[PDB]
Structure formats: structure tokens, C-alpha cells
Design an enzyme around this catalytic site. Structure first.
Site, short mmCIF file in Angstrom:
data_model
loop_
_atom_site.label_atom_id
_atom_site.label_comp_id
_atom_site.label_asym_id
_atom_site.label_seq_id
_atom_site.Cartn_x
_atom_site.Cartn_y
_atom_site.Cartn_z
N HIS A 60 1.27 -1.25 -0.55
CA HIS A 60 -0.11 0.14 -0.11
C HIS A 60 1.04 1.70 0.01
O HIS A 60 0.41 2.45 -0.17
CB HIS A 60 -0.98 0.01 1.47
N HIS A 63 7.76 1.81 3.11
CA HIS A 63 8.61 2.11 4.85
C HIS A 63 10.52 2.44 4.07
O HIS A 63 10.54 1.84 2.88
CB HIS A 63 8.43 1.80 5.54
N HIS A 90 8.07 7.32 5.70
CA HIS A 90 6.89 7.16 4.64
C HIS A 90 6.96 8.14 3.99
O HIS A 90 6.30 9.60 4.61
CB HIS A 90 6.46 5.79 4.63
N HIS A 92 2.51 8.93 2.17
CA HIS A 92 1.14 9.17 0.99
C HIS A 92 1.07 10.16 -0.04
O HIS A 92 1.67 11.37 -0.10
CB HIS A 92 0.16 9.44 2.70
N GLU A 102 -2.98 13.97 3.66
CA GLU A 102 -3.72 13.19 5.12
C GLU A 102 -4.36 14.58 5.52
O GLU A 102 -5.07 15.02 5.44
CB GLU A 102 -3.34 11.81 5.64
N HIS A 115 5.87 11.53 6.79
CA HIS A 115 6.01 11.11 8.27
C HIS A 115 7.13 10.66 8.58
O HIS A 115 7.32 9.86 7.73
CB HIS A 115 4.58 10.15 8.27
N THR A 195 -3.07 6.39 10.32
CA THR A 195 -3.65 7.24 9.48
C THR A 195 -4.53 5.76 8.20
O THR A 195 -4.70 6.23 7.78
CB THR A 195 -3.49 7.82 7.94
N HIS A 196 -3.78 4.60 8.82
CA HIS A 196 -3.85 3.09 8.24
C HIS A 196 -4.21 2.34 9.12
O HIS A 196 -3.24 2.54 10.30
CB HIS A 196 -3.60 3.18 6.83
C1 LIG Z 1 3.79 1.66 11.09
C2 LIG Z 1 4.22 3.34 10.63
C3 LIG Z 1 4.41 4.39 10.99
O1 LIG Z 1 2.73 4.37 12.10
C4 LIG Z 1 3.14 6.07 12.52
C5 LIG Z 1 2.34 6.87 11.38
O2 LIG Z 1 2.42 8.36 12.01
C6 LIG Z 1 1.99 6.55 9.96
SE1 LIG Z 1 0.70 7.31 9.63
ZN LIG Z 2 1.71 7.46 7.21
#
Ligand SMILES: C=CCOC[C@@H](O)C[SeH]
Ligand SMILES: [Zn+2]
Length: 256
Positions: A60, A63, A90, A92, A102, A115, A195-196
Site C-alpha cells: 500500500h 517504508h 514514509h 502518502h 492526509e 511522516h 492513518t491506516h
Molecule cells: C507504522 C508506521 C508509522 O506509524 C505512525 C503513523 O504516523 C504513520 Se500514519
Molecule cells: Zn503515514
């Protein structure tokens, strides 16, 4: 749970009831209503580029995972009295340039969102422990505005050709993801979530005021990653960005 419609974000509430929760992310940041706070300190990233380990295609998204065995890569300041450890960055992005980020500021949607994720190593043993914890995760969010091509995205975009398909792994070493951040770490902060899935309400968001840039072609790379497994028919990774979610009366704090 992907981002289709069969698996996509509307279907998230079935399997993860936390989706229609109270601390869901992203949000819209209404600057008018945002309570400036001065108890906040300035955000301070101290990343060490030898923590950089791996880049992986996760179907999806992709990383860039970092070495989280010690406090060499920390975020501290902001609200946080503790010192969170960096583990990942990572992105979006969206199907077209118009959307893709987002978080939204005053309704304005951006091309992509960065992020830079952290976990509370003052209070918790593992990421796995701190994933679910209210004070578990500290994520810096940078908004990515379609314009000039960002030259600090180089190494990230180069490596992508070696992780074309889902599950593909490769060493990504010798990189400080601070070089990605804007110059102004003026930030909003609010109590958020992933966010997922599993959408853990464990994230203290740090949304940067200043944006970074990305060309349409840099976004076209993100899109020409593939969500399929190697051998299968090429199914691009077109969008992986979530709708903005009700605040349910949380208070976005300015630091400016
Ligand atoms: C698992 C990865 C990082 O999770 C933290 C969130 O801020 C990503 Se939306
Ligand atoms: Zn994220």
C-alpha cells in the site's frame, strides 16, 4: 485493507471499529480556531544517519525503516516531556496532483505528505509496546506542495527502482531524514492516530507549518511503484491517503 473500495478506507470500520473513533487522523487544521499555546517548546530532531537500515515495499506504501535499538535518533521538544526514538519515514500520495496529503490546512489539500515516525523509548520497551499506547508515537508530518523538484528526495526516489513490487526489500543506509524537513519547524500538535489500520489512537501529531516541494514527476515515481507481487500484472500504487476526519472537539495547538 488497501485503499481500493473493496478493502478501501470506508471498509476500515468493519474490521477496525476505531475508525469511527474520537482521535482519528488526519484532520483539517482550521487556523482560525487553533489555540496558540506557549507552554509548547520548539521541536528538535537529532537523527543519526547510521540508523538508516532498509527500504521495503509494503503493498500500500513503502517504508524506510531505521535502527531502533538505541536513542541515537530522537525527537524531543514540542509537547513531549519524554524523548521518542525514530524508526521510520514514509509518504502518502494521491491519484492526481490536486490531492494526496492526509492532513489539510484550511481545506487545502496537498500533493503528498511525509511522516517521520517515532516511539516513546522513555516509557516503553519496544515499538510494538508503544504502538498502541496513548503516549506511544510521535510523528512529524510535512505537507508536500507540487512545484519544484525536491533534490533532497533524490536518494529515496533512486532506491525505489529496487523495490518495484510488494514485499521487495533492500538496504537503505546513510541518511538523515531531517534533511527532508522544512526550515520552519513551526508546528501544529494534536492527539491523533495512525492513518491506516490498525488505526491506533497512539499518535501525537506534529504538523509542520512550512511545506516542502515535490515535482509532478517526483510524484509520478511514487505512483509507478507497484502494489502487486513480482510476476503478477502491474497494479500501480496510485493513492494511499486517508480522508480528513472529525475533530470531535480536540484542540489543535499552534506553536506560532
Ligand atoms: C507504522 C508506521 C508509522 O506509524 C505512525 C503513523 O504516523 C504513520 Se500514519
Ligand atoms: Zn503515514
Amino acid at each position: 485493507w488497501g485503499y481500493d473500495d473493496k478493502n478501501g478506507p470506508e471498509q476500515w470500520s468493519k474490521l477496525y471499529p476505531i475508525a469511527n473513533g474520537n482521535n482519528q487522523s488526519p484532520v483539517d487544521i482550521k487556523t482560525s480556531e487553533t489555540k496558540h499555546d506557549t507552554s509548547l517548546k520548539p521541536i528538535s530532531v537529532s537523527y543519526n544517519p547510521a540508523t538508516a537500515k532498509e527500504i521495503i515495499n509494503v503493498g500500500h506504501s513503502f517504508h524506510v525503516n531505521f535502527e531502533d535499538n538505541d536513542n541515537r535518533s530522537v525527537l524531543k521538544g514540542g509537547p513531549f516531556s519524554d524523548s521518542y526514538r525514530l524508526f521510520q519515514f514514509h509518504f502518502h500520495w494521491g491519484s492526481t496532483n490536486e490531492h494526496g496529503s492526509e492532513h489539510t490546512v484550511d481545506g487545502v489539500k496537498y500533493s503528498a505528505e511525509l511522516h517521520v515516525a517515532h516511539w516513546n523509548s522513555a516509557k516503553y520497551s519496544s515499538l510494538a509496546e508503544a504502538a498502541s499506547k496513548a503516549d506511544g508515537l510521535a510523528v512529524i508530518g510535512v505537507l508536500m506542495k507540487v512545484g519544484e523538484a525536491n533534490p533532497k528526495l533524490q536518494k529515496v526516489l533512486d532506491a525505489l527502482q529496487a523495490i518495484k513490487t510488494k514485499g521487495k526489500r533492500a538496504p537503505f543506509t546513510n541518511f538523515d531524514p531531517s534533511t527532508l524537513l522544512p526550515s520552519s519547524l513551526d508546528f501544529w500538535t494534536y492527539p491523533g492516530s495512525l492513518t491506516h489500520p490498525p488505526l491506533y489512537e497512539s499518535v501525537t501529531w506534529i504538523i509542520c507549518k512550512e511545506s516542502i516541494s515535490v515535482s509532478s514527476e517526483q510524484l509520478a515515481q511514487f505512483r509507478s511503484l507497484l502494489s502487486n507481487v513480482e510476476g503478477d500484472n502491474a497494479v500501480p500504487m496510485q493513492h494511499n491517503n486517508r480522508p480528513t476526519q472529525p475533530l470531535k472537539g480536540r484542540t489543535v495547538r499552534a506553536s506560532f
